[PDB]
Design a protein around this ligand. Structure first.
Ligand SMILES: Nc1ncnc2c1ncn2[C@@H]1O[C@H](COP(=O)(O)OP(=O)(O)OP(=O)(O)O)[C@@H](O)[C@H]1O
Ligand SMILES: [Ca+2]
Ligand SMILES: [Ca+2]
Lengths: 361, 29
């Protein structure tokens, strides 16, 4: 009678039990094979150098269903150590997830894992719920994709959803590139993991790019020392803010899309004028790639410069926001009122996989 | 008058993550 919460991302699986304050298991959303039959998640990365790793979720959309089944199997049995037949399972989906995808999630849950009940919730909406809100605009940025999702009373507004096909994997790749331009060598998959750790420990968003570039050129005050696993010490400099600057200026990696301040403004402006005041004041940031220090102050500055002069702008950035989607699902699935919202196996038997559009919205 | 309305109210008044049972994460990156 304890529901499960499975938040499947492009880079990370987040899984646990509804009512808990954090997922029990967080592991890479990968399946590896020889370049046993397949390795899933934590064990596939532990042999990352001897296997072809595949990502069944790309840009937040499930695209390899066989490997996804393997991820879901690994989650239930190896990580959560539950029988899925005994637990209602809340899953999460990207914004604008194709109709056919939602149906196959349902079909696999009921027919393959024999769950008693399930549900598919939109990741960004869950993140709003974790912050205690039901109206707002979410900026959700993970490992594969970045969305602005404006939400009125629990309904995402699909005509105003913006996408940016750039997120944490691109930033890691970009930090790798500019660190090698400085002289270092990050080529192996072990070294790419070091760059990801440098990204997550030392990068930040500058309030103003040019001022910060000028400080970094004229002093050592923004340099950081990083100790490598073998004990070597390297110093990181303007790379710390150049890497996440790509979020506001995607041209750095050759993308002519708008930055996240402009997708945020353009998404508010696709919404009816009467709800824009509430959006502007309820700008929730979620996902691992919103974790950079300085990002809320920079966003505040940038949106202020785009918005009417009198508008109250508030950036909300919970300290736990790399798990905000999951925490939202943990909240929703442990509420008394939600218990009639499940799709039941009985409902599934009568209506079929397309029941998911009727009950999950 | 709507189940949806009651759910939205239940979300707003849930006290958020403080009311949730504290657990440990087995966290690989
Ligand atoms: N402290 C941090 N600073 C910067 N980036 C971080 C930090 N912590 C995690 N990340 C990045 O966040 C990403 C994973 O975030 P998240 O779990 O929200 O995405 P996902 O759900 O796997 O992917 P997506 O949402 O794009 O489908 C990784 O790129 C990771 O390196
Ligand atoms: Ca995600
Ligand atoms: Ca540009």
């Amino acid at each position: 009678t304890t529901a499960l919460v499975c938040d499947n991302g492009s880079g990370l699986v987040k899984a646990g039990f509804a009512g808990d304050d954090a997922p029990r298991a967080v592991f890479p959303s990968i399946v590896g094979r020889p370049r046993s039959d397949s390795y899933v998640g934590d064990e596939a990365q532990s042999k990352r150098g001897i296997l072809t790793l595949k990502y069944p979720i790309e840009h937040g959309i499930i695209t390899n269903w066989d490997d996804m089944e393997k991820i879901w199997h690994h989650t239930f049995y190896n990580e959560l150590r539950v029988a899925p037949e005994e637990h209602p399972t809340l899953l999460t989906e990207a914004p604008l997830n194709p109709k056919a995808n939602r149906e196959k999630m349902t079909q696999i849950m009921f027919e393959t894992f024999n769950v008693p009940a399930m549900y598919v919730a939109i990741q960004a909406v869950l993140s709003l719920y974790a912050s205690g809100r039901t109206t707002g605009i979410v900026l959700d940025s993970g490992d594969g994709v970045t969305h602005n999702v404006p939400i009125y009373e629990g309904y995402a507004l699909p005509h105003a959803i913006m996408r940016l096909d750039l997120a944490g994997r691109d930033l890691t790749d970009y930090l790798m590139k500019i660190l090698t331009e400085r002289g270092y060598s990050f080529v192996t998959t072990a070294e790419r993991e070091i760059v990801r750790d440098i990204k997550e420990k030392l990068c930040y968003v500058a309030l103003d790019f040019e001022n910060e570039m000028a400080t970094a050129a004229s002093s050592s005050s923004l340099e950081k020392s990083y100790e490598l696993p073998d004990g070597q010490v390297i110093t990181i400099g303007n790379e710390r803010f150049r890497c996440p600057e790509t979020l506001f200026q995607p041209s750095f990696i050759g993308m002519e899309s708008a930055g996240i301040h402009e997708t945020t403004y353009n998404s508010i402006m696709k919404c009816d004028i009467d709800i824009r005041k509430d959006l502007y004041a309820n700008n929730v940031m979620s996902g691992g790639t919103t974790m950079y220090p300085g990002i809320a102050d920079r966003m505040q500055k940038e949106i202020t410069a785009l918005a009417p002069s009198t508008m109250k702008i508030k950036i909300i950035a919970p300290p736990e926001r790399k798990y905000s989607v999951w925490i939202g699902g943990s909240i929703l699935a442990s509420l008394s009122t939600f218990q009639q919202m499940w799709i039941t196996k009985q409902e599934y038997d009568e209506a079929g996989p397309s029941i998911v559009h009727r009950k999950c919205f | 008058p709507s189940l949806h309305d009651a759910l939205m109210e239940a979300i707003r008044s849930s006290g958020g993550r403080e009311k949730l049972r504290k657990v440990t994460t087995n966290d690989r990156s």
